Symmetry: C11
Subunit: 129 residues, 11 copies
Amino acid sequence: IDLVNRDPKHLNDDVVKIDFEDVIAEPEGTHSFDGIWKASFTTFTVTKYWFYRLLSALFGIPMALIWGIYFAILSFLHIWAVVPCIKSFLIEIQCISRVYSIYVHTVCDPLFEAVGKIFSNVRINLQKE
Amino acid sequence: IDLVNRDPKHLNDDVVKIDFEDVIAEPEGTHSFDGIWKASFTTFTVTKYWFYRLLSALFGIPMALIWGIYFAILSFLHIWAVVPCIKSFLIEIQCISRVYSIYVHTVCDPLFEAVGKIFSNVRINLQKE
Amino acid sequence: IDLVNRDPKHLNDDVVKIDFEDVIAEPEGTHSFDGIWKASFTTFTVTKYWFYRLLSALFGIPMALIWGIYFAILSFLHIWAVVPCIKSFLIEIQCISRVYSIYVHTVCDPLFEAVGKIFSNVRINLQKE
Amino acid sequence: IDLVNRDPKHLNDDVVKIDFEDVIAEPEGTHSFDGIWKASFTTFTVTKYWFYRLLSALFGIPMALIWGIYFAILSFLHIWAVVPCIKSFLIEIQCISRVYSIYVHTVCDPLFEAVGKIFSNVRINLQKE
Amino acid sequence: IDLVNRDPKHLNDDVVKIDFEDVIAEPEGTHSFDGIWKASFTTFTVTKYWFYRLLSALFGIPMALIWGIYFAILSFLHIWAVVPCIKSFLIEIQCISRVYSIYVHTVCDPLFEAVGKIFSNVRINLQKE
Amino acid sequence: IDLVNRDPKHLNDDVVKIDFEDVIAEPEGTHSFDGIWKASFTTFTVTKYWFYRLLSALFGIPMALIWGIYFAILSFLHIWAVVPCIKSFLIEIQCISRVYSIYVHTVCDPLFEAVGKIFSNVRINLQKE
Amino acid sequence: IDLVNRDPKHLNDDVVKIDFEDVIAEPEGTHSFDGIWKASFTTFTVTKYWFYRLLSALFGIPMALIWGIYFAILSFLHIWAVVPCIKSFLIEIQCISRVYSIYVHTVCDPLFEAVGKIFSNVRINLQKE
Amino acid sequence: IDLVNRDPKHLNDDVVKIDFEDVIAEPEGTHSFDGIWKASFTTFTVTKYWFYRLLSALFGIPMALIWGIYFAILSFLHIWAVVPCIKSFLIEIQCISRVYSIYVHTVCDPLFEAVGKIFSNVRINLQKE
Amino acid sequence: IDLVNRDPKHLNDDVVKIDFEDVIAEPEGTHSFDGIWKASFTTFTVTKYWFYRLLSALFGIPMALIWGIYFAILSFLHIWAVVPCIKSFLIEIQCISRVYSIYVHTVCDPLFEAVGKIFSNVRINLQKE
Amino acid sequence: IDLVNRDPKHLNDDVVKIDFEDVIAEPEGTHSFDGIWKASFTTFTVTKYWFYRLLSALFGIPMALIWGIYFAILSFLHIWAVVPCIKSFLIEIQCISRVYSIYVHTVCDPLFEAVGKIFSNVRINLQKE
Amino acid sequence: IDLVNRDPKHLNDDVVKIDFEDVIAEPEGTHSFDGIWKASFTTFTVTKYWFYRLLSALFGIPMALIWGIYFAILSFLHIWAVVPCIKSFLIEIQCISRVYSIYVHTVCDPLFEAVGKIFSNVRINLQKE
């Protein structure tokens, strides 16, 4: 139980890291009072810190049980039912594919071979200067 | 009977390996109580561990017998019936293919050879600077 | 609390830095009176300096509280609800994608292979001069 | 009579080699009881082993005689009838092909030679920097 | 207060620099009287010199105050309202984009992969001379 | 009279060489009884061996006489009639071809020479980095 | 006051330099009388020399005053009114452009990425001779 | 009179050389009786040998006289009538061709020269890595 | 006054130089009488020599005066009226061009950037032989 | 008077050289009687030899006079009438061509120069491997 | 007066040089009587020699006078009228061309610059083998 890292996979680490400095910033020259900039910084940080913990405690645990049952059902079906079904499909469709390929290569093959004779008389003259 | 590997083919090894850390993760700063993070980890792991074993025991064995009979029938037909049928198809269609090829090469062959004379007068002048 | 930098991220630092010299400028030859150029410089700088501070004090703090609550709600939903939902979608749509791919590669594959024979008779003659 | 190889041509050796490990496999972590994994392995292997031999004995031999007669008839016709027929076709169609070629090269030949003069004035200037 | 440069940014320095020599010029041979060329030069320079100063004094200062107030309002809205609004838009539209991408890559992906087989049989013969 | 080779031209040597091993083959693991595999091999080989000889004896010789007369007639016509006829065709069509070529090169030749001036102003700038 | 150059900018120096020799010229063999070639040269030069000076004196000066006033008005408006107006336009149109870009990159981006897979199977064979 | 070569030009030497071995051939394994293969070889060779000589004797000589007269008439007309007629055609059509060329180069020449300016601003950046 | 050159600019020196030898010429073999070739040479040269001088004397001088006045008027208008008018046009049309450019680069810019992703997956395989 | 060569120009030397060996030829194996091959050779050669001389004597000379007069008339017209007429055509059509060219280069020239800016942003990345 | 060359310009020297040998020629084997070949050569040469001289004497001189007057008129008009007219056309059409160019470069210029961004993401992978 790592209570320091809590995320050694970098899955949710791009759009869920928000700080006060990443929202509001005054570059230079356009400043405000000292008594207004030291008060807004504290209000934003404290408010969102405590509010998140309240939501995670009420319906955080009754939601983890639901996902546990659902993933178990999907895992069982894939291993024992879907995989054998897909493999058996290849053996069945063998005669149709082989016969169809022979018919196509008999009709349209000579038509597209005489058309390709237009590139057989290319002559290029080059003169460097 | 390898009770450690159970899969020396890496067939189902990409979309059926799911852990708790791959679902829910809190990167940094946005944390929860210590008493809520050590309880959700246990609930998810234990629930899906025991539930999968219950399904595999009830109708795991009566399902293996069904696949045994079905694969035997497909194997016999392919070896003794389909393979000789496809091979005999090539010998039959010989006269049609040979006669058809001669007719096409007699009509459209000269038409596509005079068109290819447009590339026989290419002249290029190059001057480096 | 850095009261000098106030923006170590260069977020709003391109379209919010405006000075008097960046608005009005007389290049050369076309000048005005000395008593009119030293008065307009002071009026523009002083007026916008004090006016900005008045707005930031009235409704600057009651606006920071509103953004604090809103961001907390979005963070919770993404971690615990959206991420597990998207991952479970991949496992469900497996049989449909695999079967569909086999059907397409059986029908149109030989058609687009005989068409590509037109580039198999390219002959080029080159003569340097 | 090789009773070990039985296939020194690798003809049917890709889609007819099926084992238990190639159908059902549990990668890791998602395991079952030891008493359920040692029983399903035996049931699948034994059932398909004996079932195939039953089919091959009943109507395996009365099917080999049928293919013997059919192939003999096709072999005789190809050698003595089809081959002389195709060869005699070339000698007959000689006058038609020669006369037709002369007519096409007389009409459309000059038309496609004046069109190819658009590539005779190519000038390229290059400057490295 | 630089009374010499008055424009160390080259903002308005291309289309507002006009002299007498840049308007009227007589190259050679086609000349005029000496008493007409020394009088038109003085009239153009003096007239536009004094006229510009008259306009800049009347309504030059009452116009600088107006621009001061307007720029202050735009600066405040961008920092505190627009920037947080745009950032929060990205977090909301996450589920829609991810699901839509999966559907498109499932349907049309195999169609555009079999079409690209027409370039897999390119043969080129080259003969230098 | 070579009774060993009987075919020193490799004419019919690709689609008329069929053996038992090229039709039916069991790769590995999926085997049959020893008493069923040594009986089907003999039945297929013996049946087609004797059946072919029966057909070749009945109407093998009365068919060779027919082809002898037919080829003699075609040979005589080609040498004495077709060849002189084709050669005399070239001398007759001389005036028509020469006059037609002059007319085409007079009308459309200048039209396709002014169109080719669009490639006479190509300029390329290259900068390596 | 340069009375020799009068145009150190080469502004009007291409289409306003006309001499007698640039209009009428007799190359060789086709000559005229000596008494007709020495008289036409003088008439053309003298006539246009004096006529230009007459026009420049009458309404040359009353035309320079008009251009003096007009240029002063345009200079004032550009510096004090147009330049601030254009700059303030960029700050206003920020939210619209950013939101619109995100929507386009979400819908049509995956469509044009699967189409580009047709160039991923290029094979070229080269044989020098 | 060469009674051995009879054809020192290889004119009819490709489609008129037919032997028994080029028609019927049994590759290997599929053989016939010795008493049937030594009889068909003799029948085909003898039958076509004597039959050709019978045709060449009956109407071989009365056919050579006919071709003698016909070729004499064509030779005389070409030398004395066709050749002078074609040459005189070039001198007559001189004025029409020269005038027509001038008209075309006057109208459409400038139109196709301004269109070719689209290739005059090509810039390429290359970066090796 | 150069009475020898009379044209040191090569203006009219290509289509106004005509001699007797450039009109009529008899190459070889097809000659005429000596008394007819020495008389036609003199008649052509003398007739056109004297006729040109007659035209140049009658209305050669009254035509030079007309061109003198006309060129003076065009020169004055270009220097004093046209040139200032064109320059003042650029200053006026500044606001329209700048605003229009911003609008176009906001709407259609992202549309033509996602389309260009079809060239980002080019793979080429080369094999020399 | 060369009675051996009679054609030192190779004008009619390709389609008027016909011998007996170029018409009828028996390659090998398919021969005729010795008494039929030595008789057809003589009949063809003698018949066409004497027949040509008969035609050349009757109306060979009365045909040479006709061509003599006709060529004289065409030669005279070309030298004295056609050549001066074509040359005088160029001088007449000068004003029309020059004015027309200026008008075309004024209207459509800028239209086809802005279109060519699409090739000014080409970037290529190359990675050898 | 060169009575030997009579054409030191090679103007009419290609289609007016005709000899007897360039019209009628008998290559070899197909000859005529000696008394018919020495008579046709003389008749053709003598007839066209004397006939040409008769035409050149009757109306050869009265035709040279006509061309003398006509060329004099065209020469005078080109030098004194056409050349000044064309030059004065350029000065008149100056304002129209300059204003029109500015308008076109303002409207359609940005449209064709955003379209050219499709070539800015080209990536090529090469692998030698």
